[PDB]
Design an enzyme around this catalytic site. Sequence first.
Site, PDB file in Angstrom:
ATOM      1  N   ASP A   1     -23.721  35.306 -16.051  1.00 46.59           N
ATOM      2  CA  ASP A   1     -23.346  35.886 -16.640  1.00 46.59           C
ATOM      3  C   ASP A   1     -22.092  35.603 -17.278  1.00 46.59           C
ATOM      4  O   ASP A   1     -21.144  35.728 -18.028  1.00 46.59           O
ATOM      5  CB  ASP A   1     -23.606  36.487 -18.027  1.00 46.59           C
ATOM      6  CG  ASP A   1     -24.518  36.503 -18.264  1.00 46.59           C
ATOM      7  OD1 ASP A   1     -25.234  35.613 -18.800  1.00 46.59           O
ATOM      8  OD2 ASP A   1     -25.304  38.127 -18.443  1.00 46.59           O
TER       9      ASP A   1
ATOM     10  N   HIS B   1     -22.076  41.856 -21.851  1.00 50.18           N
ATOM     11  CA  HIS B   1     -22.071  40.875 -21.724  1.00 50.18           C
ATOM     12  C   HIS B   1     -20.860  41.198 -20.348  1.00 50.18           C
ATOM     13  O   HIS B   1     -19.825  39.860 -19.925  1.00 50.18           O
ATOM     14  CB  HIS B   1     -22.111  39.481 -21.721  1.00 50.18           C
ATOM     15  CG  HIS B   1     -23.344  38.952 -22.408  1.00 50.18           C
ATOM     16  ND1 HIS B   1     -24.029  38.877 -24.064  1.00 50.18           N
ATOM     17  CD2 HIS B   1     -24.724  38.922 -21.355  1.00 50.18           C
ATOM     18  CE1 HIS B   1     -25.082  39.461 -23.869  1.00 50.18           C
ATOM     19  NE2 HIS B   1     -25.747  38.510 -22.107  1.00 50.18           N
TER      20      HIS B   1
HETATM   21  C1  LIG Z   1     -32.676  45.815 -24.146  1.00 46.03           C
HETATM   22  N1  LIG Z   1     -32.580  44.025 -23.986  1.00 46.03           N
HETATM   23  N2  LIG Z   1     -31.783  43.673 -22.990  1.00 46.03           N
HETATM   24  C2  LIG Z   1     -31.962  42.722 -23.324  1.00 46.03           C
HETATM   25  C3  LIG Z   1     -31.521  42.492 -24.085  1.00 46.03           C
HETATM   26  C4  LIG Z   1     -31.811  41.144 -25.130  1.00 46.03           C
HETATM   27  O1  LIG Z   1     -32.177  40.371 -25.618  1.00 46.03           O
HETATM   28  N3  LIG Z   1     -30.482  39.799 -24.719  1.00 46.03           N
HETATM   29  C5  LIG Z   1     -30.401  38.717 -24.748  1.00 46.03           C
HETATM   30  C6  LIG Z   1     -28.823  38.717 -24.263  1.00 46.03           C
HETATM   31  C7  LIG Z   1     -29.432  40.817 -23.241  1.00 46.03           C
HETATM   32  C8  LIG Z   1     -32.639  43.611 -25.387  1.00 46.03           C
HETATM   33  C9  LIG Z   1     -32.340  43.921 -26.313  1.00 46.03           C
HETATM   34  O2  LIG Z   1     -32.500  45.219 -27.119  1.00 46.03           O
HETATM   35  N4  LIG Z   1     -32.869  43.122 -27.408  1.00 46.03           N
HETATM   36  C10 LIG Z   1     -33.068  43.563 -28.667  1.00 46.03           C
HETATM   37  C11 LIG Z   1     -34.532  43.812 -29.040  1.00 46.03           C
HETATM   38  C12 LIG Z   1     -34.665  43.789 -30.532  1.00 46.03           C
HETATM   39  N5  LIG Z   1     -34.099  44.659 -31.394  1.00 46.03           N
HETATM   40  C13 LIG Z   1     -35.242  43.929 -32.194  1.00 46.03           C
HETATM   41  C14 LIG Z   1     -34.422  44.331 -34.296  1.00 46.03           C
HETATM   42  C15 LIG Z   1     -35.270  43.607 -35.345  1.00 46.03           C
HETATM   43  C16 LIG Z   1     -34.295  43.925 -36.410  1.00 46.03           C
HETATM   44  C17 LIG Z   1     -33.293  45.367 -35.787  1.00 46.03           C
HETATM   45  C18 LIG Z   1     -32.737  45.585 -35.374  1.00 46.03           C
HETATM   46  C19 LIG Z   1     -33.187  45.720 -33.839  1.00 46.03           C
HETATM   47  N6  LIG Z   1     -36.267  43.083 -32.466  1.00 46.03           N
HETATM   48  N7  LIG Z   1     -36.577  43.001 -30.595  1.00 46.03           N
HETATM   49  C20 LIG Z   1     -36.822  41.945 -30.622  1.00 46.03           C
HETATM   50  C21 LIG Z   1     -38.480  42.350 -30.946  1.00 46.03           C
HETATM   51  C22 LIG Z   1     -39.306  41.641 -30.430  1.00 46.03           C
HETATM   52  C23 LIG Z   1     -39.155  40.309 -29.124  1.00 46.03           C
HETATM   53  C24 LIG Z   1     -37.659  40.689 -29.329  1.00 46.03           C
HETATM   54  N8  LIG Z   1     -36.390  40.996 -29.139  1.00 46.03           N
HETATM   55 MG   LIG Z   2     -26.537  34.996 -19.244  1.00 41.43          MG
HETATM   56 ZN   LIG Z   3     -27.298  38.570 -17.859  1.00 34.65          ZN
END
Ligand SMILES: Cn1ncc(C(=O)N2CCC2)c1C(=O)NCCc1nc(-c2ccccc2)nn1-c1ccccn1
Ligand SMILES: [Mg+2]
Ligand SMILES: [Zn+2]
EC number: 3.1.4.17
Length: 313
Positions: A107, A68
């Site tokens: 952000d 961020h």
């Molecule tokens: C790629 N991208 N771009 C923005 C963001 C973001 O979420 N954000 C908020 C700040 C930016 C992302 C991103 O990777 N998010 C993480 C996604 C995600 N990772 C996991 C997970 C679970 C267990 C162990 C390791 C990982 N579950 N999960 C997920 C699964 C279902 C529905 C939502 N999320």
């Molecule tokens: Mg934000």
């Molecule tokens: Zn953002």
Amino acid sequence: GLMQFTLPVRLCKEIELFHFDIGPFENMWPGIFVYMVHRSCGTSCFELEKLCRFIMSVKKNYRRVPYHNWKHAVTVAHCMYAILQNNHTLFTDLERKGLLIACLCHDLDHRGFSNSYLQKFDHPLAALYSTSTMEQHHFSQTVSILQLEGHNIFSTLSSSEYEQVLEIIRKAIIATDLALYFGNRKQLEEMYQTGSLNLNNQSHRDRVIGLMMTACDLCSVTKLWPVTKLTANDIYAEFWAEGDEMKKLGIQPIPMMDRDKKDEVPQGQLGFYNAVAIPCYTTLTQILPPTEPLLKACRDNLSQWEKVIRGEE
Ligand SMILES: Cn1ncc(C(=O)N2CCC2)c1C(=O)NCCc1nc(-c2ccccc2)nn1-c1ccccn1
Ligand SMILES: [Mg+2]
Ligand SMILES: [Zn+2]
């Protein structure tokens, strides 16, 4: 007035594509943004002196966090640029002005912690803003910086034009709260399918601008696979720091934030692409057909995460 920004040839051509990466040279990001304002909005939209001073104050109020950060801000503005340039005639003069600025600012003064962590820590910002805690803070920081002397990039707008642009930027920034995205896209889905969607309806425009913000904010999933993969490392570096901080407050973090559950990231990425990314770019492509390369690039990256799970990388 007769002073164009021009980029090297590879950048001049590739900046027009949705999958463009702004590169590792921090000192070129301001010139890249100004180039996009000039082509997207016009060389008259902003007083160059004020714009440059606003950009450098915005940069200064972004922190040295893994994800961020100032690179994120410029990357999100570039995706908005690509959308605006591929939908020339759909957007007002004020929307074109407001949205690139909203994206750059969306952000501001992020600490690398989610709204939940602010609420469990009992951070002062969580008492000042009960929902969309960081997003209301980002807008507040935007207004702060617009009010610094020599920083009013909107100075030539009328009183009511000024209020309309700050109101575009506010809604645009609030919409980057992913908790709001789900309901917003469901409504857009229904309006598109029942044929009720109307871009002269201001509340309909608001929703469409919100979905564009979600699309630009998530645009790491629309890049070339090596960009997507290395950006996800920065994302989890923040999440796992937040997970460590949850454990310090005596709370087991969700698995997404627990560095002990690294192994599950690939499966978590599929959840994310299926639950969030793909539906976002699908609805966006339905409403704005020339944004299809974002959907196509997102699908390619989903297939790359599927290959990761299969042990093919
Ligand atoms: C790629 N991208 N771009 C923005 C963001 C973001 O979420 N954000 C908020 C700040 C930016 C992302 C991103 O990777 N998010 C993480 C996604 C995600 N990772 C996991 C997970 C679970 C267990 C162990 C390791 C990982 N579950 N999960 C997920 C699964 C279902 C529905 C939502 N999320
Ligand atoms: Mg934000
Ligand atoms: Zn953002």
